[PDB]
Design a protein around this ligand. Structure first.
Ligand SMILES: CC(C)CCC[C@@H](C)[C@H]1CC[C@H]2[C@@H]3CC=C4C[C@@H](O)CC[C@]4(C)[C@H]3CC[C@]12C
Ligand SMILES: CC(C)CCC[C@@H](C)[C@H]1CC[C@H]2[C@@H]3CC=C4C[C@@H](O)CC[C@]4(C)[C@H]3CC[C@]12C
Ligand SMILES: Nc1nc(NCCc2ccc(O)cc2)nc2nc(-c3ccco3)nn12
Ligand SMILES: CCCCCCCC/C=C\CCCCCCCC(=O)O
Ligand SMILES: CCCCCCCC/C=C\CCCCCCCC(=O)O
Ligand SMILES: CCCCCCCC/C=C\CCCCCCCC(=O)O
Ligand code: NA
Length: 382
């Protein structure tokens, strides 16, 4: 029975999570500071997220331990301790959203990316995100709370003084706030937007790669049309497709060799010289094996690197959802099913631990998925 025993377990697990969350995320921040190849806008959002995770370990976890005792407290002081973690969760959602959008600009408008997405603007965005996060997570302190209807028997039983409550999460934070405002509007909607941004990212990477492959089969389909053609009207036709395809590819060092050759051969076809156009078009086979093939596979290789980075970002966002959704779903049962008995305490505490674990996991993702983080991690440790 002794509540101190079950409490001892919950506390030592929370403290273990805290140590890990602080250590791992301190290493992320140190790595970005030391390695100028990690100083890019994407990674300022990683740092902001790492800073939220550090604060989970230093403040949210000590707060959660404190609030699990039900200690007597002025109700608004209780709300701050109860709600501060909602600030950190929101800040995380905003950083994750920013990363998604960053990776989308990078892949869908590489033209204007560096031009549109700068480091001083990113800092301004992060500041605004933290301010909003405070405003959302501390909204119960503006009056959307249960401080005006305190549980007087619980306060008396605990020996609390005048104008104090027993400080327990569900006693002071209204469940309509947690479900409608925090979960549906501030968590769920952003996560679905994120899901939409990632669907768009992977679709765009796919269309771009089909195109590269498409333009490439066209240059080749047409080069066999030319080589087996009989009428001259055909050479013109097939070589005309190579040109257009040659420019899309250029857009999508020595393409001007390729286009110059098509142009040479084109003029021959129009002047009725089929055998010499066919032979001139044959030069196109060399410049392809020396240049055009080169654009192709490096473009393929850069594209795949961006998809890889986007996958890494999506995993981090998926793991956030996974760690936090159970608590939100429990709150939905509590709120929407009064006829149901309340989820038991051991499960409440498992869901809280699970959410806190999220703050440990990201450094491992970085280390296993991003070579530059991993290399920087290994150097720091020596
Ligand atoms: C960078 C840091 C060290 C700056 C200084 C932080 C100080 C002001 C903080 C850290 C710990 C805090 C204390 C933590 C707990 C309590 C108990 C509460 O019933 C009254 C406030 C009181 C006594 C706090 C007062 C402010 C405090 C002393
Ligand atoms: C944020 C950094 C710089 C400092 C550490 C946070 C400090 C300010 C936090 C940590 C714990 C908090 C306290 C927790 C409990 C109580 C008792 C309640 O009856 C009034 C509010 C009061 C006194 C809180 C005031 C703010 C507090 C002291
Ligand atoms: N419902 C809930 N409870 C708690 N803590 C108190 C757990 C509890 C619940 C009932 C009870 O009688 C005694 C203790 N922390 C909580 N944090 C959250 C939360 C954060 C983000 C989403 O939900 N929900 N939440
Ligand atoms: C480098 C230090 C990192 C760890 C810092 C942890 C500091 C935790 C700060 C506050 C914990 C909350 C304690 C509140 C106790 C209230 C007790 C009371 O109301 O009488
Ligand atoms: C991050 C800054 C850390 C600075 C050190 C802060 C140290 C204070 C930590 C915990 C204090 C909580 C003690 C609560 C005692 C109240 C119980 C009581 O006496 O009735
Ligand atoms: C300034 C930084 C921290 C201020 C701490 C405020 C403590 C409020 C005391 C509450 C009380 O007397 O019950
Ligand atoms: Na987080």
């Amino acid at each position: 029975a002794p509540p101190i025993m079950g409490s001892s377990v919950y506390i030592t697990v929370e403290l273990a999570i805290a140590v890990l969350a602080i250590l791992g995320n301190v290493l992320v921040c140190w790595a970005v500071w030391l390695n100028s190849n990690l100083q890019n806008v994407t990674n300022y959002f990683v740092v902001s997220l790492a800073a939220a995770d550090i604060l989970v370990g230093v403040l949210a976890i000590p707060f959660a331990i404190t609030i699990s005792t039900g200690f007597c407290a002025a109700c608004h002081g209780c709300l701050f301790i109860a709600c501060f973690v909602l600030v950190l969760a929101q800040s995380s959602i905003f950083s994750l959203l920013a990363i998604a959008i960053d990776r989308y600009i990078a892949i869908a408008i590489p033209l204007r990316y560096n031009g549109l997405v700068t480091g001083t603007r990113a800092a301004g965005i992060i500041a605004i995100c933290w301010v909003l996060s405070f405003a959302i997570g501390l909204t119960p302190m503006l009056g959307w709370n249960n401080c005006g209807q305190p549980k007087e028997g619980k306060a008396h039983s605990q020996g609390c003084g005048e104008g104090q409550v027993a400080c327990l999460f569900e006693d002071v934070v209204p469940m309509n706030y947690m479900v409608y405002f925090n979960f549906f509007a501030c968590v769920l909607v952003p996560l679905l937007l994120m899901l939409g941004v990632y669907l768009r990212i992977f679709a765009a990477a796919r269309r771009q790669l089909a195109d590269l492959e498409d333009n490439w089969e066209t240059l080749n389909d047409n080069l066999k049309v030319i080589e087996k053609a009989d009428n001259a009207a055909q050479v013109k036709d097939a070589l005309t497709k190579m040109r257009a395809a040659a420019l899309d590819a250029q857009k999508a060092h020595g393409f001007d060799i390729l286009v110059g050759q098509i142009d040479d051969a084109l003029k021959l076809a129009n002047e009725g010289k089929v055998k010499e156009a066919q032979a001139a078009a044959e030069q196109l086979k060399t410049t392809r094996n020396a240049y055009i093939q080169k654009y192709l596979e490096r473009a393929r290789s850069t594209l795949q690197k961006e998809v890889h980075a986007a996958k890494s970002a999506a995993i981090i966002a998926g793991l956030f959802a996974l760690c936090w959704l159970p608590l939100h779903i429990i709150n939905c049962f509590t709120f929407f099913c009064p006829d149901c008995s309340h989820a038991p305490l051991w499960l409440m505490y498992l869901a809280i631990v699970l959410a806190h674990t999220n703050s440990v996991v990201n450094p491992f993702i970085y280390a296993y998925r991003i070579r530059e983080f991993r290399q920087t991690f290994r150097k720091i440790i020596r």
